[PDB]
Design a protein around this nucleic acid. Structure first.
Ligand SMILES: [Zn+2]
Ligand SMILES: [Zn+2]
Ligand SMILES: [Zn+2]
Ligand SMILES: [Zn+2]
Lengths: 463, 463
RNA sequence: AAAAAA
RNA sequence: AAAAAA
């Protein structure tokens, strides 16, 4: 009557953890990133960012005076009101680095959470400055510096680990949240760089170790997952910049370099080249003085003792007057204004509001890309037109990306071996590209590969 | 009553040379370049090239068997019949380098001119091979090897000087035709590279000397004059390739590199990297063997004694079978097929017509660009689809251009100080970009800056 | 941005 | 691909 069919060994389940991946902002767009990681009833927030272009489309703005609710209505700050309906209490806010798409919304949203703000030293300095620049939301959260390779136990069941990585700003980290059932890894704004000009090479060994210890979920940026191959190293930008600055038959012509003030590796390269060219490096711009000086006071960069740094309008105008009468061949001005921002040094120069006069053949080196949005594109077009009309020669895009490419994401999937993968930090189109890469690696959409929209919670019941 | 005055000039001399710039091919399109420089009745032809896409659009066509007139009707070679209306006798044919857009039409057009063919040693080797495979015209011009930095006296009034430059193939030169009234400089397919991995740095000193001695006219390529800034050095391609090949956590996976067979510097880099990776470099492909062997056999490269080189179908299939049974992680195959050419090694592999089987995770590195015309785009798309469907990971465009950018052209204008400038070697759109740069430098179109079409002769007289 | 092809 | 603004 009855035949035996077979046997199956049932596994043990010694620890049941309910994980929640909550997408607050930056899953439908570039900017205003915010993620919440729930471990049963505790919540770790990662990255309260701003979306700058939605600010730029309104002329009468002054983000500093606006309340967070209007900023949410504008879509510039993550709509974190969904947090009142996530089942848990926030125990920490973590920021992976100091870019505004990760810390820009801190002074508008952090004060409502009874939780510290945990970040790397440079990031904590930048967060403190960002909060100090507003006196409308009095945000006085405890601010904790956690260095890369260090751990901090936030709950008996939750620990936070920073992993060193590379990016277009120093002191970027992966975040690993360790839970009774494994690790949740957050990797947004990262880049593998085996030859960085500043810092150490990302911790591939620890990444393999984490992959072997158990990763429940990987939250990772999708920004350049559609660019084939691997990201070029910062060394490539360094060498291209060296060739533009030194490899020329027009040594004694005027030269200006503009780049991101927070791109400390790039700025460091530029000032060392200045020493090679026999020119004095002159950093111009409030943001230049702030960011480079902060880096210097934390021991992140070294600086030649002939460097000159001016952030004040009249010190800047005076330095430019001194440069003009001493000879532009005698200095290398590194200044703000690469996106044509009004009020930045290069834009005031282009408008003739300056003692510095651009002449035919003067070289202007944009060690940056143009941010692909119509607003910044219009500003850069106006600035470049003005500079070209005064005879300047433009060296654009002397630059490499700060984001992992498709094959970098492939390698990170192979190292971390996550049970689940969640693309973050982009549009649904960038997520599409990531999804096709992840399917190539074995993941399945809606099963182990998850497409989230702003305001959605993915629940993971890990045995 | 009314009165004024004027000084009449003397009709006396304080012996007249007429210069002619004749555009035959390559001024309306990419490919089939050919220029004629006339000094009163003597003519120096520069570059009889082929335009390959006009061949590719016709099904199953044997250019080697075709007459010159059918090829001209196809648009695939310069229409030199206009030479029967130019008042002079051709005294020399000069080729600036061995690319097919400069030498491909030689076995169809050179034999009708009572003149030698003058080129650099490597270029002469390639020309001799090109003639040997010709099967319709009996070509018996003498081929004279002239090294860079040497001069050769062609007529009582005309000498030819080669100046070394950098390009995507070794032994490229500028040509300076010295006449009684000054020099005519031809600079097509050149690139400034202060750190080349092969050859010497272009002779900037001689270029300045020429500019000060007197240059009547500069004929120059416009190919990338619309690219802002300066061309990245070949060292950049070298370092990107080094990082792709060496910078990975997947040491023991299969890797295949494809690149231009004539890019001897790139191939040299790849083989030295193979030595670093602990793999055996195996060059596969008829063109690979021909070009690399000619370079090695003339002392342009050195090669490790473990290198293997196979141009024959069965040596190739045997080497691939040996690679599969010895382990793909133990070899670095450098092969033809980067444009998806049918019959090339990579294409036959993708078609599964070889012992080599591509598996998931195998890396295919195109150290090349996709040539922007619909035919090669279709071929590369088919090849890439086939490779991706077999699990390959694609690293594309690990590559830098071999052509000067806008500011490189600016500095060459500043060095050579030509009286007249003539853009060549591109479409009228590329010439538009050049013209806009040259107007920035003081030239005026139709006066000292001249946009010529195929089949036009520009006259340059003495004041 | 000018091949591949034995 | 996330600013500037003494
Ligand atoms: Zn960032
Ligand atoms: Zn970001
Ligand atoms: Zn060429
Ligand atoms: Zn060419």
């Amino acid at each position: 009557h009855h035949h035996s069919s077979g046997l199956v060994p049932r596994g043990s389940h010694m620890a049941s953890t309910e994980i929640g991946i909550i997408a607050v902002g930056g899953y439908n767009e570039m900017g205003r990133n915010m993620t919440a990681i729930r471990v049963n009833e505790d919540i770790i927030i990662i990255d309260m960012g701003i979306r700058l272009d939605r600010v730029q489309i309104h002329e009468d703005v002054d983000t500093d005076r606006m309340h967070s609710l209007e900023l949410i209505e504008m879509g510039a700050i993550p709509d974190d009101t969904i947090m009142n309906e996530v089942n848990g209490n926030v125990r920490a806010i973590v920021c992976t680095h100091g870019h505004l798409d990760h810390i820009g919304a801190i002074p508008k949203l952090a004060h409502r959470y009874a939780a510290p703000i945990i970040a790397t030293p440079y990031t904590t300095a930048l967060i403190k400055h960002q909060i100090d620049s507003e006196r409308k939301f009095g945000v006085k959260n405890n601010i904790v510096a956690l260095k890369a390779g260090e751990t901090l136990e936030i709950t008996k069941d939750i620990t936070i680990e920073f992993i060193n990585t590379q990016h277009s700003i120093i002191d970027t980290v992966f975040v690993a949240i360790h839970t009774p059932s494994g690790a949740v890894v957050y990797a947004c704004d990262f880049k593998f760089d085996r030859t960085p000009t500043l810092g150490e090479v990302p911790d591939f060994d620890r990444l393999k170790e984490l992959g072997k210890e158990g990763v429940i979920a990987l939250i990772t940026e999708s920004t350049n997952a559609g660019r084939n191959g691997k990201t070029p190293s910062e060394l490539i930008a360094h060498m291209m910049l060296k060739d533009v600055l030194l490899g020329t038959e027009e040594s004694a012509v005027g030269m200006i370099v503009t780049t991101f003030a927070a791109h400390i590796a790039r700025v460091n390269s530029i000032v060392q080249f200045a020493q090679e060219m026999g020119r004095i490096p002159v950093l111009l711009g409030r943001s230049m003085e702030r960011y480079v000086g902060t880096a210097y006071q934390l021991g992140y960069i070294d600086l030649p003792e002939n460097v000159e740094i001016y952030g004040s309008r009249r010190d800047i105008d005076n330095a430019l007057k001194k440069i003009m009468e001493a000879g532009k061949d005698k200095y290398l001005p590194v200044m703000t204004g690469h996106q044509g921002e009004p009020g930045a040094v290069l834009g005031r120069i282009a408008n003739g509001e300056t003692p510095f006069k651009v002449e035919t053949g003067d070289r202007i080196i944009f060690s940056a890309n143009v941010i692909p949005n119509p607003m910044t594109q219009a500003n850069r077009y106006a600035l470049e037109t003005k500079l070209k009309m005064k005879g300047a020669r433009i060296y654009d895009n002397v630059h490499v990306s700060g984001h992992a490419y498709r094959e970098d994401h492939w390698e990170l999937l192979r190292m971390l071996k996550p049970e689940h993968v969640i693309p973050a930090h982009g549009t649904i189109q960038m997520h599409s590209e990531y999804i096709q890469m992840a399917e190539d690696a074995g993941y399945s959409l809606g099963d182990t590969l998850h497409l989230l929209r702003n305001g959605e919670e993915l629940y993971i019941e890990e045995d």
